[PDB]
Symmetry: C5
Subunit: 201 residues, 5 copies
Amino acid sequence: LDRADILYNIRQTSRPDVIPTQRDRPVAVSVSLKFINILEVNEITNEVDVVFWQQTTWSDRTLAWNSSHSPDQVSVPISSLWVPDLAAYNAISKPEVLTPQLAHVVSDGEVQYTPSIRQRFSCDVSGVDTESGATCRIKIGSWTHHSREISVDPTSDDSEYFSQYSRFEILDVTQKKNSVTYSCCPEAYEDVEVSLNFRKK
Amino acid sequence: LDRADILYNIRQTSRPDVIPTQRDRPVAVSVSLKFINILEVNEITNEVDVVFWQQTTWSDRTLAWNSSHSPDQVSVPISSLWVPDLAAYNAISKPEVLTPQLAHVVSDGEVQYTPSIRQRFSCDVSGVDTESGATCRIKIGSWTHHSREISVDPTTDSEYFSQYSRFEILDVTQKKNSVTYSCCPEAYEDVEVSLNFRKK
Amino acid sequence: LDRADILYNIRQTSRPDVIPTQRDRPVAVSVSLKFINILEVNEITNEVDVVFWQQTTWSDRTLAWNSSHSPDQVSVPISSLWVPDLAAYNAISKPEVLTPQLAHVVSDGEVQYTPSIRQRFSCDVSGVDTESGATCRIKIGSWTHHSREISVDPTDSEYFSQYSRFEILDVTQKKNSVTYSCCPEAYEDVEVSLNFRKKG
Amino acid sequence: LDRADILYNIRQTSRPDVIPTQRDRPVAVSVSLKFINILEVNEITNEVDVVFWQQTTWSDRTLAWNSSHSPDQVSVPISSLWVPDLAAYNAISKPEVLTPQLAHVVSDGEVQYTPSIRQRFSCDVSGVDTESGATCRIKIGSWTHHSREISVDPTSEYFSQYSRFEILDVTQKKNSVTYSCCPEAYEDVEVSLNFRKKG
Amino acid sequence: LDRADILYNIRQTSRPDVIPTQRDRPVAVSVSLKFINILEVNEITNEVDVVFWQQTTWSDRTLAWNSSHSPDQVSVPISSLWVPDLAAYNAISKPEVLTPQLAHVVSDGEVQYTPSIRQRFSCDVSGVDTESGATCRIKIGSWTHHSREISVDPTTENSDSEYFSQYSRFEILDVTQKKNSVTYSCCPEAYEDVEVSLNFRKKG
Ligand SMILES: CCOc1cncc(N2CCCNCC2)c1
Ligand SMILES: CCOc1cncc(N2CCCNCC2)c1
Ligand SMILES: CCOc1cncc(N2CCCNCC2)c1
Ligand SMILES: CCOc1cncc(N2CCCNCC2)c1
Ligand SMILES: CCOc1cncc(N2CCCNCC2)c1
Ligand SMILES: *[C@@H]1O[C@H](CO)[C@@H](O)[C@H](O)[C@H]1NC(C)=O
């Protein structure tokens, strides 16, 4: 098998529609935000403009191949793969995807998709000009799949890729997992809450 | 049947251009708005910016399957389904869809599509800075189908409204209208949603 | 015939790129604007922002069917139909289509497409803050088809928003036939005169 | 042949990806701008907002038919035709196309595509509020085809009375430029627009 | 072979999704930015608006043909070719592509794709109103391919203000390029990028 052969098979048999559940177990999706920039803060209206990498990881055995005398990885356009339907519950603009829309696929079936995203959010901005900073929370989860179909789980150094040229600095980043029951359905929907503690320089 | 088989059948036989009428009764569509945020109010020009979930529900027996040893639900890209042509009559911008465009389908043929939408409207904003608040009405209905083809009905408040908004919701009421336009002798149903809100 | 059958036939044989001329006669297109809102006026730069329904009507016998024991109308995505190539000559932005893009088709071949459109224009705005108002003209016609291929013909506050900062005093329509420097053929258009002013 | 037949044949055989060279001679493209409006001038940053028709004309024998008992013209969606890859070198926004994207095709193979375009440019704006006016130049040419594949050549009438500005004069000239990347020459047309603020 | 034949073969056999590696080696991509304009500078927020040509060059033998009595070049829509997945790491808006999306292909398999792009960046703007100017760096590299799959390198050749607009409010003092090889926290592989340093100031 060469790369040409693998990508060919993937294009033909992939099923981008079909969630890769294994035996009535959820697909375990890991989500991690790497903050890159903080752009436009408004303490009056409680809105922020963030740039971050949304590192997303899951398993899809449908994609697997024998990597014996073969490449053990390929890059695949996301249009040819199933992808989790994650959304930011407190976003007030649609995600603007800055980078090429390719996913990394390893021969075992492990997929990683890490787009860079600029997005505007609604959160608590009070104290941004204070020594203790503001704490903004971002809630991310599956939009249509409940806890028995998709589970989201958190995966560091906050500022590792954070821009030195931003007008702001990161004090701390914490992650926690929630399981919420909405008024519509009897099933639970998991999400990850990412708390970003930051202030003006 | 597994999910792969169901989604396959749906993709092949769905007929997204064809309204799923049953013996010449209307398709009963339910509409419900869940307000999430209020963003940019202008009392001078009478314009608001709202973010809301537009929960939409109807029945399409064409999609049904027998689920004896089978999943009883799947998520389907809306491009593969018939979807009601609802529009907001007093919208002054096109809907900006914030979420993935998937619908939930249950084995009986029940469909639910609930996108999160940011949209700008033209409505009565006067008194927004008052203890009694402004009351903005949003009128939503089918754009091309009359009352014998599609009927819209409200469902039988700040539950998801943002605590960080500059505004707060006082009350939300729903009522149904049946209107005859100058163009046609048929009636067109819509739902009017009254949003009572003020500045904090 | 049921709806499923008719929409199927239309999808297979419609020919969206082929103008439905009959025996060398122009397709007769009727155009009517229903004003919904006036949004952003600038008397300095002579620019207005209008929201209107662009009601467009014509005949296409290719789409006809026997409605004996059948539906006499269906809704069709405009991507599956020929549609006239109308443009606003004095528009300074592209049309923003607010509604679902469906046309109404009747069994005789009559098509009606009425999208709601927000668009910015360049026109005479002087006297907008006066008792007699400004008169803005909008010129709409076929972009590439001359008078022997497409003819356009005309058909106030009825659907105008009470919450606009402006009010409509009068709307008049007239038809022009213009010869451009490029070609010896005449191109028809409709000119719609909108007389409006600021309230209070 | 009727219109239905012609449009059918065109859809099946057109080859939009293939430049219609004849005997390895350039395709001769004619370009003409008709100014419709001038919208947002900034003398400080040297930027203007223009609305103009970009009248573009060339020949493609692949599209020809016998007109003998037939129509001699049809309208064709540009997605079904080869079209020249013209670009404005000093544009600072992408073209916003205001009109339906149809080209006019005559039975001999002559094509005309005239979209109305709103675009923002970077040019000399100084003296816009002066009796002699500013002179803004717009440079338009093929982006990827050199002078042996595509040649471009020049060819208030529709200008808005309601603009805050007026046109004093419009001149056209042709340039042939060699860039640092390739040994071939690339043709373009430079359109000089002399305009000022009204009084 | 005529143009029609070559473009036909390319459309049928091209493989846009398959990186054209040769015998286990990186695809060598060359990158060069030609600055055309500087538009909106904000020293307070450290943001600039740039227009530049992004000249990108690589080799794909899959596209080659015998040019013995034939054309030696064609223009191809990028949708029918493999293209390197380059991204600007400090961009804060998506690239706005100003030009037709065609690539130049030579019979040997050499491809050149040079779009004109308007983009907003986050960089050091301090001293823009000073005689010595600001120095803004732009970091460009492959988003998903590591150093053994794609290598990026600055162009060997020499040349800046060559296509820079005389009508900009700003002027270019100098442009330097250097290559970096970075290891990220996610993977054990190295990712190459090019860093382009743009020294510029406001005109007097
Ligand atoms: C019947 C469940 O179908 C649905 C379709 N789209 C969205 C939702 N939502 C509620 C579940 C959790 N996500 C928020 C929206 C539910
Ligand atoms: C008879 C159906 O013809 C029509 C085609 N498009 C829109 C409408 N409208 C009138 C009905 C209510 N919706 C707004 C416009 C009617
Ligand atoms: C030579 C006729 O072909 C044409 C191709 N595109 C546009 C036009 N127009 C001139 C007629 C009126 N509409 C504006 C542009 C004509
Ligand atoms: C080998 C020529 O390939 C090219 C691919 N893209 C753009 C250009 N340009 C330089 C030629 C003149 N036009 C500007 C763009 C050249
Ligand atoms: C495990 C490698 O998979 C990946 C999939 N998408 C993006 C990245 N990135 C990290 C490597 C350097 N480029 C930035 C994004 C990595
Ligand atoms: C290229 O073309 C000529 C004849 O038309 C031929 O002699 C030559 O061998 C060909 N080269 C190849 C296939 O490498």
